[PDB]
Structure formats: structure tokens, C-alpha cells
């Protein structure tokens, strides 16, 4: 299943030529986490660093839990949408965009596309195509 977690990430960041593709897992503690992990070279891997353990909030598990896609073109325009908690993040590790569509069976986890060179209008068929590869890892989990 690991495996089949790092091929996925690999696989989508190829298909979007996004900077990053990783998978976020929210933990039975309420905690949530990074768990797979494809990068370009230019940036930092995540999984590598030692963050100290991050709440995944219950107003967002019961948002994440209905499956719909957020597309994130600009997080820092002040009506993209970006949780007010992850502004000095996107600062820190220079995200400009970001695509997330949650793993549901119940939230599982987040696959979750980083623009790091530019902000990034993400159109409407790839909305549809991060569904159709969420749909893809909740049916390798069952
Ligand atoms: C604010 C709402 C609360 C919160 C929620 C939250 N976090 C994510 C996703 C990620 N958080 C990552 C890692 C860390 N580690 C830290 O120490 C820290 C604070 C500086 C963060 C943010 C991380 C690698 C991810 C996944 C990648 C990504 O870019 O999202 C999410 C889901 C994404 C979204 O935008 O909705 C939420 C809701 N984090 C907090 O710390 C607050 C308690």
C-alpha cells in the first residue's frame, strides 16, 4: 500500500507537472499527517522534516467528508479561501497554488497538488480528474 501510494503521487504530479503531489492522512487521534510524497528537486521534501503534530480540525473533517474538490489558484489572494492557520506555511515553503480533493470510504486523507513557480488557474477538467483519481486510491482501499 505504500508503494501504491508513492506510484500514485509520482504518477499525478507527472500528469499535472505540478512542483509537488502528496497524500495527507488525518490520524484517529485528530491529528493529520503527510504520507506520500512526490517532489521536484528544486523544493524540499515535507515527509523529511520534523513538524510538530498539526490538529486536522473537525470544522474541516466535516467540510473534507462531503468530497468536493477545492482549487486554490492564488493562496494568497485574500478571496482564494486558504485556511487563515497555513499563511506562514505557504510563506515558508513558497506555495502559490494548490489542488485538493479529499479520500473518503468518513475522511480518510487529502491528495493535494503545490504550485511552487507560479500561481495556476486549475481548470474545471482537472477538478474532475483529481475526483476520478480519489475515487481510484478509496477503491486500492477497499
Ligand atoms: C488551520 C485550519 C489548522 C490546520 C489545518 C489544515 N492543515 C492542512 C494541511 C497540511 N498541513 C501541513 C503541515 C503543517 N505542519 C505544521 O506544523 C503546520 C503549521 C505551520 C502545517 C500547516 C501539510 C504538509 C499539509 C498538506 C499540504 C497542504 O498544502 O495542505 C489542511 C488541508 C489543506 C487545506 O488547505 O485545507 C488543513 C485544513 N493546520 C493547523 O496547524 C491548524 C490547527
Not at 507537472?17 to 528544486?42: C, F, M, N, W
Not at 473533517?61 to 494568497?76: F, K, N
Not at 506555495?95 to 474545471?124: E, M
Request: negative net charge; glycine residues 4%; charged residues 20%.
Amino acid at each position: 500500500m505504500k508503494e501504491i501510494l508513492h506510484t500514485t503521487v509520482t504518477e499525478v504530479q507527472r500528469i499535472l507537472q505540478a512542483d509537488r503531489v502528496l497524500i495527507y492522512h488525518v490520524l484517529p487521534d485528530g491529528t493529520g499527517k503527510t504520507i506520500s510524497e512526490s517532489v521536484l528537486p528544486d523544493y524540499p521534501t515535507l515527509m523529511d522534516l520534523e513538524f510538530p503534530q498539526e490538529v486536522f480540525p473537525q470544522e474541516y473533517q466535516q467540510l473534507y467528508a462531503q468530497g468536493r474538490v477545492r482549487a486554490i489558484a492564488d493562496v494568497h489572494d485574500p478571496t482564494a479561501g486558504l485556511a487563515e492557520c497555513l499563511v506562514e506555511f505557504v510563506d515558508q515553503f513558497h506555495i502559490k497554488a494548490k489542488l485538493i480533493v479529499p479520500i473518503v470510504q468518513q475522511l480518510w486523507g487529502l491528495l493535494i497538488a503545490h504550485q511552487c513557480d507560479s500561481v495556476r488557474q486549475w481548470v474545471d477538467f482537472e477538478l474532475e480528474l483529481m475526483q476520478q483519481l480519489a475515487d481510484q486510491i478509496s477503491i486500492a482501499l477497499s
